[PDB]
């Protein structure tokens, strides 16, 4: 658990289950090096927002 | 006697001793009673090299 | 290797023919036929722990000083029980006192060789409070008085040494005699034991006198003899534990009762034994315990969590960053490693799949000779995949690289194909290192090839695209171009933005597997959660036990897709036409024939040398000890890790002073990337093979041993020293700790860091000497200053962020025995030959018969006292003149005469000794000056008189004055009376040395064998100690432990057996 | 009366720490350590070392830095005392300059 | 601390009283003995070293450095500052 | 080398080792000389003038 | 002794073989 653990609280995809990041990095930004958590953690908070405002 | 110095008495007494010697008379260039400079005759800045 | 034989040949038995040499004859035959820190890292010596003790257990003896005089004209000789020949439990004698000796009525298997042994006090006990720093002390009957205070804790620290023991149940039998009627006496071995049955029970001898000891005893209590309990579990068998009555010492009981209950706790069971032996072998050995009402055994091998990552802290201290410590290491465990792994070599794979290339002869390069030149298979070359290997578990101090003579000088070129070569067998050796700058340098490494062929890039002038691969070792290193992809531009430089492609994409990913038990053996690892063990590339378990070849792997993906990049790179548009078409298509068969070449070491490595690993691990020297692994994430790259033994100056607080009090741990060991590619590219299995039989059959002759069992003892025994080290370094010395002090009253001088590094090292060498230990202890803590001693370990990654961990210190028997000590010692310094207050050297003259120890009220003065001239730093003296009586200024600067009372500290009696002694000695011996030396604490000798005839005592004080130096000074002699059983006549006595407080706590009894005492000093049997047999409504378990000794107590004797462990745990074969 | 030195002094009593940064001796020493540790440590300025003996360096410097010597303590505690008691009793009195 | 006892009495003279004035003039005949020469001077600062040697409690040994090293730079560092000599003169 | 070793005595002490070394020093003292002789030197330095 | 391969060459010192 050194990269972090990510919980899905509100009904998972298949079950109560825990989400491990690992070292692989997104290089599709230019000026930032984003590694895996940090994408899911952007990409999910990017979806919630979207659904928010629809 | 059953007590020694810890710092010593005859070394510390040798140093002192060696330590009270007086300065060396450096008589060099100087006159003699008749009038001649005592010294030898190098040059000045060779001769304090 | 090749050793071809001269010279010197005889004869062959099995065929009479005679050949050239001895070498080639055996050979014939046959075919008929047909430091120091190494090695305590290595095997690190074992402690003795358990130790029985057959003999009562006391270290309190009686002695008799001056005889009774049992011939007498008032009693007649039938009177007293001596003529009689009746042994009894105490000496028959004038004057008895108690004086300390350790396990004098003891008898052990294994001795602690450090005593404590005290003469009486009529003799000189001198030499036992100069034995720790009196270097310059020139007589042999003076000590310093300023370690007085170092002396004593030594003293008490061999005291609590020696007396760690545990008791042992020897055997029993009934007394036919009246005497105790029904008693279970105990019995002990020896040449004899007829004194012992006396010794041992004093309520047990006959009452027929009136004298002390009879009466004592027939004021005891009847019904507490020997044995009233016991454990007992089967019928013929010896019980486990009783509990007697016998003459025995509260503070022995006490120190041995503490320390069987630090090995009960210790204590584990054949249940928990094969629950840890099967978890840590996986299930591929399996072990037995029996299921049945055992003896209790006593396995004291379990150890709390603590000690186990201090004792790691100072391994990691003693591997600094020497290289050959640690290096042994990895050979140890590279051929121990060979034992279990299944995976051969026939190293003929690459010639036969080489041998079978199309190539035409009129050719000139020959691209398979070249490759099969470069590799040179040969058989020894896999020690070095062993110690690749095994430095995964170790990558926390070692860092495994690759050495620079593997690189190519200058580089090369691409035009060159051994330059290519060399390529290929780095890019294939470099994941299997732990060096966290390999990624890199494989990018730099190819980089460097094609100089002007492709240019990219490349940060400052410095490093640049043409500096040497193997200078890109730190992270700070890494260039844009590597880091930022894009930067590299895909038009003209397709090459290298493809591989640094492949390498951000196919690196291997970092996994772990789970190893070892904390049941019982507990985690040492740190910096990591418990139970962990990190790998650099990822484990996939095999759901399979009969392995076949498959190619779905990060290895051999990583070798195809070096393949594909150098088939890409010889089908280039600008390389193409620089090659002979024949060529070209004999270096891509080449690239073809060996992408797909059928080697079993990569599937090894994914699926069984991560569970070798697992299984080795737990039982070992030295314990792994990793820091978290990264791929590609340059921020969390480690850069340093460090332990820390002292604070700055004045904080007190590990996690404030670990940032600028480390030491950087870290060290490079360099290998060879021809062993490694040979090895990745050769490896085969045995042509039938199952995985679950190997390994059985492999792992179970290694779980045969105690020698982890020996290192958990060891690091209890290290953590118990290091916590007894700083809590007497912190008795002399003000320091960080918290920790209560008693021994203030003794005077001590100022201590240095040498003076605590002199006695950090004598307590070393003392529990050395204790627990029969030889390689080094504590040691690695004695570098620096030892009045602030702290543990604590941190590693800092690249952006900044700092993980420390600092364990807590556990309890420590020895070190709570040790202050238990000095707390008795508080109230009983008097039996260990030392006495308190201060002495008054006044003459007095009389015929009473007082002990001078205990002074009357009368003749004792202070500093409260109306009339009485205290001095102090100023001591001027002035002569008179003309009959004007001699003055000396006082302390404020008054002189006075000689005469009166004064006090003088006993630093200024040393400082003037020689001019006080002439002025001062001709009032005191007639005069009325009296001097009152304040000390503190002091050394003290008896001398007896008969109180009959003059006794004059003159000569001891002037011989004492006179000895008086400002090093040092000798015991102080005292004039004792001796006590009279009947009338004697009186003589006058002239007395000079008195004592202050009342010092006679030594004092046992007075005419032993008589009635009563009529004259002199005396006092009874003391009823203070006997409280069991004297109080009927004391129960029989009560101690009062911090002001007296008792002299007689309930005391445990255990029965417990330790047997081996693999005597109780059989393993299936 | 008094009689310069190029370093300061304190009063005598041989019961300090001998790590102990308030002397100045020592202070510089450390500070010369954490320079060639800042130094040495992003392995710039060293082009051509082939292994990484940054965590070699960076030990022996805190090694060095943690030292047990006490002379700094000597210098500024005892040196003094042993000068102005020499300094009466010399054939040649000082001749000092500030 | 010292003491000089005496009984009284006015015959006794001892002259042991200069000026500053004095002390300084012959300070200054001495700075201007030397004359730019090392031979006068080497012998005063050579006894002078002998003496604070005999004097000072410091006692010298590079044998901590060597137990601290435990033996690269540790090596390199060793060779450099030469434990095995013994002159601190 | 001078620097970063050195170590007192264990056992120490500034009194009696200062006053152990002081007392051949002074008992071998010549400024009471030195004294009597600047007196000399500036009453034949002004006599010269 | 020691043989070279090569060209049969035995050379007595194990290191100068190199
Ligand atoms: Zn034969
Ligand atoms: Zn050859």
């Known amino acids: 658990s050194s990269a972090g653990v990510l919980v899905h609280y509100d009904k998972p995809t298949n079950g109560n289950h825990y989400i491990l990041g690992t070292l692989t990095q997104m290089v599709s930004a230019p000026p930032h090096i984003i590694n895996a958590t940090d994408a899911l953690l952007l990409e999910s908070c990017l979806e919630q927002f979207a659904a928010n405002v629809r | ?49 | 290797p090749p050793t071809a034989s001269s010279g010197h040949g005889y004869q062959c038995h099995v065929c009479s023919a005679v050949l050239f040499s001895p070498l080639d004859l055996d050979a014939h035959v046959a075919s008929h036929g047909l430091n120091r820190k190494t090695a305590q890292l290595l095997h690190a010596d074992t402690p003795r722990l358990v130790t029985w003790d057959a003999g009562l257990c006391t270290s309190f003896k009686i002695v008799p000083i001056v005889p009774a005089q049992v011939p007498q004209d008032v009693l007649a000789y039938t009177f007293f029980t001596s003529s009689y020949a009746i042994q009894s439990p105490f000496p028959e004698a004038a004057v008895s006192r108690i004086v300390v000796h350790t396990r004098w009525a003891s008898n052990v298997d294994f001795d602690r060789d450090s005593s404590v042994i005290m003469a009486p006090p009529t003799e000189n006990n001198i030499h036992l409070f100069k034995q720790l720093l009196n270097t310059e002390t020139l007589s042999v009957r003076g000590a310093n008085p300023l370690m007085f205070r170092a002396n004593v804790l030594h003293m008490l620290l061999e005291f609590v040494l020696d007396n760690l023991y545990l008791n042992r149940h020897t055997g029993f039998s009934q007394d036919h005699t009246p005497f105790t009627e029904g008693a279970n006496l105990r019995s002990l071995p020896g040449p004899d034991a007829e004194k012992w049955y006396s010794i041992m029970y004093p309520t047990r001898m006959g009452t027929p006198n009136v004298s002390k000891i009879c009466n004592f005893v027939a004021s005891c209590v009847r019904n507490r003899v020997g044995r009233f309990d016991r454990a007992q579990m089967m019928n013929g068998a010896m019980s486990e534990w009783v509990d007697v009555f016998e003459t025995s010492d509260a503070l022995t009981v006490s120190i041995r009762g503490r320390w069987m209950a630090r090995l009960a706790r210790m204590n584990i069971n054949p249940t928990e034994i094969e629950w840890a032996l099967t978890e840590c072998a996986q299930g591929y050995v399996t072990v037995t315990s029996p299921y049945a009402p055992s003896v209790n055994r006593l396995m004291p091998y379990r150890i709390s969590n603590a000690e186990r990552q201090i004792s790691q802290i100072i391994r990691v201290m003693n591997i600094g960053n020497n290289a050959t410590v640690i290096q042994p290491v990895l050979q140890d465990i590279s051929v121990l490693l060979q034992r279990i792994s299944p995976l051969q070599i026939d190293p003929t794979i690459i010639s036969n799949t080489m041998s079978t290339v199309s190539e035409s002869t009129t050719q000139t390069l020959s691209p398979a000779s070249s490759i099969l030149g470069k590799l040179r298979p040969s058989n020894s070359d896999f020690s070095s995949f062993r110690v690749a290997l095994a430095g995964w578990l170790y990558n926390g101090v070692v860092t495994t690289v690759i050495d620079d003579s593997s690189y190519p000088k200058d580089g090369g070129s691409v035009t060159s194909l051994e330059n290519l070569w060399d390529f290929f067998i780095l890019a294939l050796a470099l994941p299997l290192t732990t060096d966290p700058c390999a990624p890199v340098k494989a990018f730099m490494t190819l980089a460097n090839m094609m100089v002007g062929f492709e240019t990219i890039p490349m940060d400052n002038q410095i490093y640049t695209q043409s500096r040497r691969a193997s200078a890109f070792s730190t992270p700070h290193t890494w260039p844009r171009c590597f880091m930022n992809i894009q930067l590299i531009s895909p038009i003209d430089a397709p090459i290298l933005r493809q591989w640094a492609e492949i390498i951000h994409r196919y690196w291997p990913n970092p996994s772990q597997i789970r190893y070892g038990t904390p049941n019982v053996f507990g985690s040492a690892n740190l910096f990591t959660p418990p139970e962990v063990l990190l790998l650099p590339i990822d484990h996939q378990p095999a759901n399979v036990t009969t392995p076949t070849l498959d190619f779905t792997n990060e290895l051999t993906n990583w070798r195809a897709r070096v393949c594909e990049l150098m088939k890409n790179l010889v089908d280039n548009q600008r390389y193409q036409p620089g090659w002979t078409q024949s060529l070209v298509s004999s270096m891509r068969g080449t690239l073809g024939k060996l992408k797909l070449i059928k080697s079993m070491t990569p599937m090894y490595l994914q699926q069984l040398a991560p569970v070798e690993l697992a299984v080795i691990a737990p039982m070992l020297p030295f314990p792994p000890f990793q820091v978290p692994y990264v791929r590609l994430d340059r921020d969390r790259v480690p850069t340093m890790v460090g332990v820390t033994r002292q604070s700055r100056d004045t904080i007190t607080q590990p996690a404030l002073s670990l940032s600028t009090t480390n030491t950087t741990v870290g060290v490079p060991l360099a290998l060879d990337a021809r062993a490694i590619t040979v090895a990745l590219l050769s490896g085969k299995y045995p042509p039938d093979l199952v995985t679950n039989v190997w390994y059985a059959d492999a792992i179970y002759p290694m779980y045969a041993d105690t020698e982890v069992f020996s290192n958990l003892q060891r690091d209890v025994i290290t953590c118990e020293a290091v916590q007894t080290l700083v809590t007497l370094v912190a008795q002399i010395s003000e320091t960080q700790y918290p920790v209560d002090r008693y021994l203030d009253w003794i005077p001590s001088l100022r201590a240095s860091a040498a003076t605590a590094a002199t006695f950090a090292e004598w307590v070393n060498t003392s529990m050395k000497t204790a627990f029969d230990l030889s390689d080094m202890l504590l040691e690695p803590l004695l570098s620096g200053d030892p009045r602030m001693t702290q543990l604590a370990i941190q590693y800092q990654q690249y952006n900044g962020r700092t993980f420390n961990v600092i364990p807590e210190m556990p309890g420590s028997v020895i070190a709570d025995c040790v202050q238990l000590t000095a707390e008795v010692f508080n109230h009983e310094y008097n039996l260990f030959g030392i006495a308190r207050g201060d002495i008054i050297i006044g003459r007095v003259q009389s015929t009473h018969l007082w002990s001078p120890l205990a002074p009357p009220p009368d003749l004792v003065f202070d500093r409260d006292t109306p009339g009485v001239h205290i001095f102090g730093r100023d001591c001027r003296i002035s002569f008179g003149m003309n009959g004007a009586a001699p003055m000396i200024r006082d302390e404020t600067g008054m002189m006075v005469p000689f005469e009166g009372n004064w006090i003088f500290p006993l630093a200024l009696w040393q400082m003037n000794t020689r001019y006080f002694n002439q002025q001062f000695d001709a009032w005191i011996k007639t005069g009325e000056l009296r001097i009152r030396i304040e000390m503190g604490a002091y050394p003290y000798m008896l001398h007896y008189y008969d109180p009959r005839q003059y006794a004059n005592a003159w000569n001891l004080t002037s011989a004492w004055l006179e000895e008086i130096t400002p090093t040092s000074i000798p015991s102080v002699p005292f004039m004792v009376p001796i006590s009279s059983d009947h009338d004697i006549s009186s003589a006058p006595a002239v007395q000079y040395i008195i004592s202050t407080e009342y010092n006679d706590r030594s004092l046992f009894c007075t005419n032993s064998s008589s009635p009563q005492t009529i004259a002199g000093p005396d006092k009874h049997i003391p009823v203070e100690r006997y409280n069991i047999l004297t109080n009927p409504d004391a129960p029989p378990t009560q101690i009062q432990l911090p002001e007296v000794v008792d002299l007689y107590n309930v005391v445990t004797r255990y029965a417990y057996e330790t047997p081996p462990i693999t005597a109780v745990v059989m393993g299936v074969p």
């Open chain 2, 1 to 49: 006697e059953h007590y020694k110095a810890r710092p010593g008495i005859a070394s510390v007494q040798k140093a002192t001793e060696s330590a009270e010697l007086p300065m060396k008379n450096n008589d060099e260039g100087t006159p003699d009673k008749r009038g001649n400079t005592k010294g030898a005759l190098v040059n000045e800045h060779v001769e304090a090299r």
